[PDB]
Amino acid sequence: KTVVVTTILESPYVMMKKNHEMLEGNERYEGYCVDLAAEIAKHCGFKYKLTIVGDGKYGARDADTKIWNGMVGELVYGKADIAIAPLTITLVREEVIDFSKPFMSLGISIMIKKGTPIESAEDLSKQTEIAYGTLDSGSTKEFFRRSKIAVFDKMWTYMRSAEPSVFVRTTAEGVARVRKSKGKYAYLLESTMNEYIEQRKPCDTMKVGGNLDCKGYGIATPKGSSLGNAVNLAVLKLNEQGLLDKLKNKWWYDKGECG
Amino acid sequence: KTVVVTTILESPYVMMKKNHEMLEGNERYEGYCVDLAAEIAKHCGFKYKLTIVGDGKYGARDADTKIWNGMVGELVYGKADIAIAPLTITLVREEVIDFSKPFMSLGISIMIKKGTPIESAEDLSKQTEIAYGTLDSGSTKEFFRRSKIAVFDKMWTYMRSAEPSVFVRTTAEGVARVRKSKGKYAYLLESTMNEYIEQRKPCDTMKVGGNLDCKGYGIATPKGSSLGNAVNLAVLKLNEQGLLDKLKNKWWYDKGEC
Ligand SMILES: NS(=O)(=O)c1cccc2c1c([N+](=O)[O-])cc1[nH]c(=O)c(=O)[nH]c12
Numbered sequence: 001k002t003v004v005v006t007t008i009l010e011s012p013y014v015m016m017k018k019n020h021e022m023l024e025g026n027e028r029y030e031g032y033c034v035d036l037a038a039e040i041a042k043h044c045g046f047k048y049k050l051t052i053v054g055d056g057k058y059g060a061r062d063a064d065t066k067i068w069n070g071m072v073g074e075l076v077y078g079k080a081d082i083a084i085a086p087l088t089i090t091l092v093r094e095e096v097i098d099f100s101k102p103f104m105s106l107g108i109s110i111m112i113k114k115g116t117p118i119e120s121a122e123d124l125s126k127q128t129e130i131a132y133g134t135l136d137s138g139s140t141k142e143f144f145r146r147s148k149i150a151v152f153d154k155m156w157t158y159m160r161s162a163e164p165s166v167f168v169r170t171t172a173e174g175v176a177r178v179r180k181s182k183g184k185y186a187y188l189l190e191s192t193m194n195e196y197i198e199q200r201k202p203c204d205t206m207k208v209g210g211n212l213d214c215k216g217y218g219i220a221t222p223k224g225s226s227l228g229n230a231v232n233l234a235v236l237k238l239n240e241q242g243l244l245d246k247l248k249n250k251w252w253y254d255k256g257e258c259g
Numbered sequence: 260k261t262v263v264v265t266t267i268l269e270s271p272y273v274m275m276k277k278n279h280e281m282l283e284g285n286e287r288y289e290g291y292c293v294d295l296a297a298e299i300a301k302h303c304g305f306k307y308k309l310t311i312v313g314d315g316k317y318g319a320r321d322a323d324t325k326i327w328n329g330m331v332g333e334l335v336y337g338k339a340d341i342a343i344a345p346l347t348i349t350l351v352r353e354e355v356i357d358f359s360k361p362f363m364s365l366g367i368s369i370m371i372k373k374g375t376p377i378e379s380a381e382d383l384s385k386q387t388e389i390a391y392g393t394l395d396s397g398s399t400k401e402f403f404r405r406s407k408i409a410v411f412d413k414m415w416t417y418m419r420s421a422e423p424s425v426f427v428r429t430t431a432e433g434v435a436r437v438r439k440s441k442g443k444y445a446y447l448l449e450s451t452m453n454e455y456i457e458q459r460k461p462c463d464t465m466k467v468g469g470n471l472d473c474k475g476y477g478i479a480t481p482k483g484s485s486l487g488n489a490v491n492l493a494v495l496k497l498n499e500q501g502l503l504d505k506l507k508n509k510w511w512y513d514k515g516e517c
Pocket residue numbers: 010058059086087088135138171189190192193
């Protein structure tokens with residue numbers, strides 16, 4: 001009867017509480033997805049146990065081994081009943097798991113150090129004194145590689161052959177590069193993470209311009225789950241009631257540090 | 260049995276065949292949503308009758324009367340079983356009907372007359388020689404009114420008080436305005452429609468820049484429908500199989516004129 005929820009340590013979605021070793025079970029954790037899991041569980045009427053994905057991954061098919069890793073793998077291989085995490089809805093994942101309606105929308109966005117004279121992707125594309133880049137792997141890099149929109153193709157042509165490399169290995173590294181680069185590096189990343197960091201001390205970064213594309217995070221269940229329909233209904237209702245917007249404001253802005 | 264499908268005459272989703280007068284039933288119509296209805300019906304295993312919505316509307320709640328009009332109304336009040344049309348997924352509609360996963364994604368986009376020196380919303384926002392606007396009502400105007408993104412707020416502040424009015428009553432009026440203005444009017448509208456018109460003679464308009472926001476069209480059923488889940492599974496499968504991409508290319512590009 002107890003539903004196993006797989007999730008991932010990613011701020012502000014799921015974080016260890018400061019006193020987690022004194023605590024046990026679900027009370028060890030806090031965050032946007034901790035709150036959302038409680039609301040989903042209420043609407044669907046189940047008891048649940050939050051469990052952090054063992055490999056700290058979201059989920060992809062290991063191309064060497066054909067085996068799914070991450071939270072997706074935990075669902076496919078029967079170890080968890082539901083994933084409640086910032087897990088991107090993608091076609092390759094939809095082949096092996098089901099997603100709810102998105103509970104959060106997002107897109108590629110521009111992070112600058114405050115004071116940088118950049119307002120848009122167009123601004124970046126037409127210049128070079130301010131370097132700009134993405135994660136060295138993953139879907140943000142791929143969006144630019146594949147784009148046939150003129151501005152994003154212009155940007156990809158610059159990034160792919162820029163020296164020294166404008167790509168970074170982790171999000172932390174891209175954010176640190178923005179902060180340390182005295183206005184001469186801009187970093188392309190998820191709007192949600194960009195907005196979160198804009199509310200973190202030292203309050204020296206800023207999101208500029210509109211989002212470049214459209215994606216969503218969804219609640220995932222194994223195919224054939226007795227839960228898929230109730231979960232989708234719960235996301236719909238929570239969205240309609242403003243609960244998702246309330247949780248976003250809680251974890252990004254009420255708990256933000258930059259006013 | 261026989262599922263009543265409500266839809267709307269909107270190119271290239273649903274159109275009268277040139278020879279519709281000789282024809283009857285579903286065979287009078289052609290288009291992306293006609294083909295999609297046939298595929299959904301196949302995957303779900305039902306026979307169906309296509310019917311054009313009586314009042315020619317998508318669906319809104321008459322704020323005076325509480326009564327839903329359009330295809331949404333036909334679902335809510337039991338006159339149709341499923342809507343297969345370019346019907347936007349919105350929260351106020353989700354309160355009274357169910358939507359599938361989106362079968363088409365779209366967003367606000369910029370139409371220019373070819374030769375116009377504009378590539379982006381930022382380009383429009385920084386000048387005035389080229390007027391630009393939206394429909395006089397609806398969600399594109401609301402997007403600009405409500406936006407807190409600097410560039411779109413700048414565009415709204417310009418549009419709301421621009422003289423003469425930059426707004427238009429119909430999309431036909433906006434496209435004709437672009438075409439007749441020798442490059443001094445640009446029109447903000449749905450990317451899907453912009454892309455369609457770009458492939459139509461006289462081949463004098465163009466979509467520039469990326470989309471400004473994110474929306475979707477979905478298949479709609481009344482709440483509690485025995486069809487909602489099968490319809491959703493069918494959209495998922497048709498998307499995964501590439502059929503939706505194939506139909507888009509058919510009606511926008513294989514059948515394009517440019
Ligand atoms: N700190 S980060 O820039 O944004 C970030 C960087 C890189 C990959 C991310 C990711 C985030 N995220 O928002 O938490 C979620 C997420 N979800 C997935 O499903 C996936 O495959 N990859 C990711």
